Amino acid sequence: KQIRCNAVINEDPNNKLIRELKDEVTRLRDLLYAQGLG
Amino acid sequence: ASVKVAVRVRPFNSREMSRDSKCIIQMSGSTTTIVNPKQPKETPKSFSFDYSYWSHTSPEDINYASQKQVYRDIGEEMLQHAFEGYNVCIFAYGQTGAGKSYTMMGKQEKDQQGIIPQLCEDLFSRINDTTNDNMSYSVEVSYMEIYCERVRDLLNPKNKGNLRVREHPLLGPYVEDLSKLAVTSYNDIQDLMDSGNKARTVAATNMNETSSRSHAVFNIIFTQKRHDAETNITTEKVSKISLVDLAGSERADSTGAKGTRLKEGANINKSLTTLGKVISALAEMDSGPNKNKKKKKTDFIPYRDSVLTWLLRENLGGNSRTAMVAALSPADINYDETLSTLRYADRAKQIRCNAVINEDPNNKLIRELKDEVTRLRDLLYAQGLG
Amino acid sequence: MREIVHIQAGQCGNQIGAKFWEVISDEHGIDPTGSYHGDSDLQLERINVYYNEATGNKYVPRAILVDLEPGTMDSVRSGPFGQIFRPDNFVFGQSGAGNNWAKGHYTEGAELVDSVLDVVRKESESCDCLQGFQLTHSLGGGTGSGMGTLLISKIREEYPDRIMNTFSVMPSPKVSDTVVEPYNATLSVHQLVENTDETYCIDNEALYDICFRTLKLTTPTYGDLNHLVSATMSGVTTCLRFPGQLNADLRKLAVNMVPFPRLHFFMPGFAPLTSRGSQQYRALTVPELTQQMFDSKNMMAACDPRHGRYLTVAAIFRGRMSMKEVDEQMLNVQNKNSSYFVEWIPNNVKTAVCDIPPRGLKMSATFIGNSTAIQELFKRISEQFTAMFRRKAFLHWYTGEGMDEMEFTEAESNMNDLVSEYQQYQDATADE
Amino acid sequence: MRECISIHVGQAGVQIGNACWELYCLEHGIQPDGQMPSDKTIGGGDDSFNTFFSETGAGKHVPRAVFVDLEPTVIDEVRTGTYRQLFHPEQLITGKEDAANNYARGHYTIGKEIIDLVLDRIRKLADQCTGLQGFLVFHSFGGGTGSGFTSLLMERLSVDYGKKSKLEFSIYPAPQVSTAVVEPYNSILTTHTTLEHSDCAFMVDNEAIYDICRRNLDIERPTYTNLNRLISQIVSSITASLRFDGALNVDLTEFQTNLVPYPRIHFPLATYAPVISAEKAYHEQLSVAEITNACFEPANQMVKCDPRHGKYMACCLLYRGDVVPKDVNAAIATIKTKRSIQFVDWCPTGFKVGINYQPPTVVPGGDLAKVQRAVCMLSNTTAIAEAWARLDHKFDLMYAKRAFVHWYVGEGMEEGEFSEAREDMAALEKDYEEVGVDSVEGEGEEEGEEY
Ligand SMILES: CC(=O)O[C@H]1C(=O)[C@@]2(C)[C@H]([C@H](OC(=O)c3ccccc3)[C@]3(O)C[C@H](OC(=O)[C@H](O)[C@@H](NC(=O)c4ccccc4)c4ccccc4)C(C)=C1C3(C)C)[C@]1(OC(C)=O)CO[C@@H]1C[C@@H]2O
Numbered sequence A: 001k002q003i004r005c006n007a008v009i010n011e012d013p014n015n016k017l018i019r020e021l022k023d024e025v026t027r028l029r030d031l032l033y034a035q036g037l038g
Numbered sequence B: 001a002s003v004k005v006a007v008r009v010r011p012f013n014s015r016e017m018s019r020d021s022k023c024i025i026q027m028s029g030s031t032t033t034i035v036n037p038k039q040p041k042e043t044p045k046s047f048s049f050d051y052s053y054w055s056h057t058s059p060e061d062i063n064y065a066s067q068k069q070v071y072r073d074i075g076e077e078m079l080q081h082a083f084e085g086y087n088v089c090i091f092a093y094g095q096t097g098a099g100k101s102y103t104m105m106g107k108q109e110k111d112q113q114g115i116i117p118q119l120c121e122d123l124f125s126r127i128n129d130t131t132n133d134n135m136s137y138s139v140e141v142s143y144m145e146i147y148c149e150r151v152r153d154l155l156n157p158k159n160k161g162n163l164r165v166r167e168h169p170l171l172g173p174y175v176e177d178l179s180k181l182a183v184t185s186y187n188d189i190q191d192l193m194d195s196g197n198k199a200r201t202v203a204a205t206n207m208n209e210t211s212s213r214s215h216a217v218f219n220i221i222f223t224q225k226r227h228d229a230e231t232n233i234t235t236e237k238v239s240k241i242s243l244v245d246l247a248g249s250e251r252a253d254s255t256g257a258k259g260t261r262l263k264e265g266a267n268i269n270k271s272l273t274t275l276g277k278v279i280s281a282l283a284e285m286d287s288g289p290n291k292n293k294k295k296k297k298t299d300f301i302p303y304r305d306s307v308l309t310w311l312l313r314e315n316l317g318g319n320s321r322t323a324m325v326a327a328l329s330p331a332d333i334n335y336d337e338t339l340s341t342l343r344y345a346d347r348a349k350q351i352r353c354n355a356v357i358n359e360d361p362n363n364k365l366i367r368e369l370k371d372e373v374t375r376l377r378d379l380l381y382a383q384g385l386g
Numbered sequence C: 001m002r003e004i005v006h007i008q009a010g011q012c013g014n015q016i017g018a019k020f021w022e023v024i025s026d027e028h029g030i031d032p033t034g035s036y037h038g039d040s041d042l043q044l045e046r047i048n049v050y051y052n053e054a055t056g057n058k059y060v061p062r063a064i065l066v067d068l069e070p071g072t073m074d075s076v077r078s079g080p081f082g083q084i085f086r087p088d089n090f091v092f093g094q095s096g097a098g099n100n101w102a103k104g105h106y107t108e109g110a111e112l113v114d115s116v117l118d119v120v121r122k123e124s125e126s127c128d129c130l131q132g133f134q135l136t137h138s139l140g141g142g143t144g145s146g147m148g149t150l151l152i153s154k155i156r157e158e159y160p161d162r163i164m165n166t167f168s169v170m171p172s173p174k175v176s177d178t179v180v181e182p183y184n185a186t187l188s189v190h191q192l193v194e195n196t197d198e199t200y201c202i203d204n205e206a207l208y209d210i211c212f213r214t215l216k217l218t219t220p221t222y223g224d225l226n227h228l229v230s231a232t233m234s235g236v237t238t239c240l241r242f243p244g245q246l247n248a249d250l251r252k253l254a255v256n257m258v259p260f261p262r263l264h265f266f267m268p269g270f271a272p273l274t275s276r277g278s279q280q281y282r283a284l285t286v287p288e289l290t291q292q293m294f295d296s297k298n299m300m301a302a303c304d305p306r307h308g309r310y311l312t313v314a315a316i317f318r319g320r321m322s323m324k325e326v327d328e329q330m331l332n333v334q335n336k337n338s339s340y341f342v343e344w345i346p347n348n349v350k351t352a353v354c355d356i357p358p359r360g361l362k363m364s365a366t367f368i369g370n371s372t373a374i375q376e377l378f379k380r381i382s383e384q385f386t387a388m389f390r391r392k393a394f395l396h397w398y399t400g401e402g403m404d405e406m407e408f409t410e411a412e413s414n415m416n417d418l419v420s421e422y423q424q425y426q427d428a429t430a431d432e
Numbered sequence D: 001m002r003e004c005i006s007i008h009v010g011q012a013g014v015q016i017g018n019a020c021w022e023l024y025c026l027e028h029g030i031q032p033d034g035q036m037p038s039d040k041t042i043g044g045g046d047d048s049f050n051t052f053f054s055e056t057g058a059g060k061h062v063p064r065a066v067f068v069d070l071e072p073t074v075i076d077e078v079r080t081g082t083y084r085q086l087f088h089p090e091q092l093i094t095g096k097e098d099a100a101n102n103y104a105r106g107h108y109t110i111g112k113e114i115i116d117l118v119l120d121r122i123r124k125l126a127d128q129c130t131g132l133q134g135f136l137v138f139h140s141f142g143g144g145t146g147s148g149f150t151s152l153l154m155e156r157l158s159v160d161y162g163k164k165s166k167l168e169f170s171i172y173p174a175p176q177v178s179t180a181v182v183e184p185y186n187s188i189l190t191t192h193t194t195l196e197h198s199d200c201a202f203m204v205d206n207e208a209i210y211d212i213c214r215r216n217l218d219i220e221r222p223t224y225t226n227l228n229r230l231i232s233q234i235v236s237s238i239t240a241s242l243r244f245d246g247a248l249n250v251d252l253t254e255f256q257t258n259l260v261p262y263p264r265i266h267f268p269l270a271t272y273a274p275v276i277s278a279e280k281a282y283h284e285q286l287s288v289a290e291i292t293n294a295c296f297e298p299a300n301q302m303v304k305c306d307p308r309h310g311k312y313m314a315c316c317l318l319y320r321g322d323v324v325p326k327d328v329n330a331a332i333a334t335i336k337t338k339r340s341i342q343f344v345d346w347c348p349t350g351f352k353v354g355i356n357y358q359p360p361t362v363v364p365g366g367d368l369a370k371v372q373r374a375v376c377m378l379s380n381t382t383a384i385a386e387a388w389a390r391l392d393h394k395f396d397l398m399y400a401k402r403a404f405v406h407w408y409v410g411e412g413m414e415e416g417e418f419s420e421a422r423e424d425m426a427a428l429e430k431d432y433e434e435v436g437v438d439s440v441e442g443e444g445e446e447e448g449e450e451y
């Protein structure tokens, strides 16, 4: 019963931190702009 | 930032006191006045420089500048900039027998030392007192010469050959297989400096008994390490101190060169002419794009015409904080030469620079994004959203 | 007494050199066996520029033939003038470069360069007063590019005060014969811009255009292209060998053509060229030679001079003629075409006149231009280079021989800086 | 001394070798018994070209060839035929059974005890050589010996010699016609070796050659002799550059330098242009432009694949005969302006050109006309992926049910090996799909700083 394994891709620490910080910056900037504080 | 400019007038030598001994240099504060010995009616043309030093009269207190005064004015500030995380350069200029070698190196067996001795002294001091459990420092030394458009290593004399000059895409020109050595104490760099000075090519001419035959570059790579648990920047600053002693322009009639000496003089004059051309142009272009308006279309600075300007591409412009120390002779007979130096020094005042602190680009982006997150969090919290 | 050492590398260099020695031997009346059978007494007066004397009243050319594939050497020996060369100067190995610049420069040529330099030293130490060297090779190939550059570097290290000439065939836009021409051309130019005093650009496209359009040939082979090139080589150094009303050594051309050290890439040309059937209509004189000299279609580099400006030009005439007519014609060419010459060089045309023409002609002349339009050619190579270096198209062959991406990047940067330096003076204004 | 060592493995290899050595003997004036009367009549010369033949003291010429097989039949046909006195008596034929369309039987079980003799004789031939250039290995996919034993031999040669080039001519299985039920297993098993241990693999397909023979030569009922003669002409065209003089000579290293962008893409197609009958040789000019155009026609390809479905990454044109450079340049310029022929954007140059003076020869009893000009084109392109994909499908259709598998495991293999080979094949196919893609639009995404 050979079943699908799927790859074992995970996060790269530097790229992970960069992506998460960029997303957080975008979210906070959007929140500021929505309320007229940017 | 702009190129710092210092000028320094020296006393008589035997050749000048044997012949006519009338001075033409006068000085006051930060202003230097030349007077034409052939035209006493003409205006005493004057130049303004960031620093001016008068070593003509040893015992007098009328603005006399010893070796220490020059160091505290220029080298201390440049070493402070080095600790701030900036690449810095100090390079000498002028004609033959004016004081380049003395100013940069001086005489070791005296209380009259050059910029390089006192700079390494003060650096070794500052790393010694500021040493801590978490703070640490490392320093490495190298010393090269350009003899006949061929780079030679001074620290290791057994190399006996011309090294190869390469171009890193990001860091610019460099010298391959350059014997950079690690040092830990002032005795070590003293030994390296004495070995290098013994290794340099020096020959005697009529203008100078120990005229230099090759440009020389002394490079100190300095690294500060700040390691702590939280995320403290490890090996944060990496600065390069470049101390450059150039050979001086020569005239065959006064120098009396023949054979190998004349060819060495010809190569030296070629390199200095290329350097002067590069200095003039960095100047005009900057001043323009700076005053003119801001087109920035295209300006070609001929760095590649000589190896000297090629190795010093980042110091004469771009990523470095650079200072130019011009040497001046007082004798009337040398007038047509001295004015030329001053003229180029004036143009060196116009050149600008763009230096920035070094870091890993990934860590740069991470720090910048973290700062942006902190700023946005503070803004949201202040306004009642965060 | 001024004397030249001649070096040949690769197939193209060897074949051009063979044709060149045929032409020169004809000019000096040298039999293929080496004996002299001339008529004029001025043929032997300066024979020692190119030839050494040998015991049986014979003359041996001062030539060095170099390759890594033996076959080309055989094609030289089994030819009309194969026996003229001394066999000790045929330097070759085995396992040719295979169109790989790395093999020619670093791996294979590094072993044979010592032998070639030994023969060069032997030929140069017997010279009374050496003037310079001249090398014929192809930039778009293997052993030619690599070993020519290596020999040039070594010789400039050994003989810095001497002249280094170079006749290079560089890649054309349309006519392509190997897949990796841009890599070899870029690295070769990176070496040449540093280590050479003069470099004459030659393009197969321009030579085919001359053969088709001017000479009206229907089946041009490589022999005719070698013929044109060899005529140019002889025209360059005419003035060392024969008297004239106004001499011009190689150093005079170098001084008057090169304003700054890195701009020494020259566009060559020759006149007259009459197509064997229209010569009965054209009257030969200095104005006709000048008209054909500056014509765009007559240039040998496939770069239109009308797309730039002439930094400098040099014209060397051969034949009995008046200096007044020559000076007036050059002056007229300057003033009428006022927009194709820089304004910060007054009188940027050099003139030389030699008394003795070629054997079959009453008049002749050669042209050495130095213009910014040459930048176009370099730009082309750079474009192709990028198109193959972004994806690393064939890089493993070069990196297996002991190279890295650093060398490719620095060569590309040097070529781009050279292009910018030429482009600095191209546009008008600037002035005074 | 541009010397080459030929290795023929299996029935297809031996028969192609018969054709090749007939052609070589006729080109050089060598008789079937090894003597060359031309030197005796003239008094001496270079006609004993060292590329293929080694000269002894007595004047005999022994070829630099090595035949290998596990059936005595195919080479016993050669030991008693016309050319019995040409080859050295040592022919390396195992007096046992055959691999039986089984990769395992020829690689693991019976390929041993014959491999040592083969490498010993190859060593003896290589020691006689000065400036050896490479090996030319002839074999067949889908056979037992030609796949497994070629795998083992290539592995051992890559271990021993290392730097010498190893070119490979092989018969790929056709899309529709086949001569065995277990072709896909053997082909997929031997791809794993020919990918790593070879330097350049030329593939030919029998359906394509039959179509060419039917359409061009007007042969309604061809046999293997005609296909072998065509392949012999192609190999002679490849190797002519290091046997005769020419305007532009292309050695075996220039081949690999110009036609192989990356190490895993060394599978070019091959075509021969002036394939025409004697009757139709008239009513035709046979100029350079015509043959250069005919090389690019999809109908004339020797592998059943359409170049119009892919992109050309490299081309190498080798001309023979009364040819001059200007016509070659004009033909290349004409081809570059056609829209149906697409080149990858990362290869602006595209073309390698070689010219040789020696015109092609005519074999008595053949079917190709005597011509003054000829060209052989070799094209590294991406259409070849199609020729692999079909085979992959076939393999799957048998491996889902494990048909014919116990024969392979009974001879010293295990099941997982099959899977491994299949995975490798996918990777190779993926690589082609990655190299034919156009560079991303303005490869540095976009740009344009200040001024
Ligand atoms: C009536 C007559 O004499 O005929 C001419 C002739 O018809 C023309 C067309 C000749 C002729 O040249 C060609 O046809 C030709 C073909 C392909 C490539 C180059 C030339 C000529 O072949 C070439 C030959 O030239 C020479 O002999 C020069 O000295 C020349 N030497 C050689 O070509 C040469 C040939 C074989 C062996 C050694 C030398 C030379 C030129 C410059 C510098 C040194 C030497 C000449 C006078 C002619 C012919 C014979 C038809 C021309 O020759 C040159 C380049 O000087 C081509 O245009 C010129 C001008 C002439 O009018």
Ligand SMILES: Nc1nc2c(ncn2[C@@H]2O[C@H](COP(=O)(O)OP(=O)(O)OP(=O)(O)O)[C@@H](O)[C@H]2O)c(=O)[nH]1
Binding pocket: D009, D010, D011, D012, D013, D015, D016, D070, D071, D098, D099, D100, D101, D102, D106, D140, D141, D142, D143, D144, D145, D146, D171, D178, D179, D180, D206, D224, D225, D227, D228
């Ligand atoms: N073009 C061509 N193909 C051939 C020839 N002989 C055999 N083949 C092909 O080879 C394939 C079979 O593999 P073989 O070469 O017979 O394998 P083998 O050499 O017999 O090895 P064993 O199977 O162990 O006997 C068939 O599909 C044929 O199409 C030939 O003479 N010319």
Ligand SMILES: Nc1ncnc2c1ncn2[C@@H]1O[C@H](COP(=O)(O)OP(=O)(O)NP(=O)(O)O)[C@@H](O)[C@H]1O
Binding pocket: B008, B009, B010, B011, B013, B055, B095, B096, B097, B098, B099, B100, B101, B102, B103, B208, B210, B211, B212, B213, B246, B247, B248
């Ligand atoms: N400010 C100064 N005060 C006292 N002595 C000085 C001063 N400047 C230079 N000298 C001396 O004057 C001479 C000239 O200085 P020196 O450094 O040799 O010039 P130089 O340019 O380095 N020599 P050269 O290599 O030919 O250019 C030396 O003997 C110095 O010691």
Ligand SMILES: Nc1nc2c(ncn2[C@@H]2O[C@H](COP(=O)(O)OP(=O)(O)O)[C@@H](O)[C@H]2O)c(=O)[nH]1
Binding pocket: C009, C010, C011, C012, C013, C015, C016, C097, C099, C138, C140, C141, C142, C143, C144, C145, C169, C176, C177, C178, C204, C222, C223, C225, C226
């Ligand atoms: N003018 C001329 N060009 C040639 C000749 N032979 C080859 N070439 C050019 O040289 C290039 C090939 O370079 P090649 O000589 O093979 O380089 P090498 O292998 O290092 O010797 C091609 O682009 C040709 O255009 C010739 O006889 N005359």
Ligand SMILES: [Mg+2]
Binding pocket: B100, B101, B210, B211, B212, B247
């Ligand atoms: Mg000094």
Ligand SMILES: [Mg+2]
Binding pocket: D010, D011, D071, D098
């Ligand atoms: Mg069989």
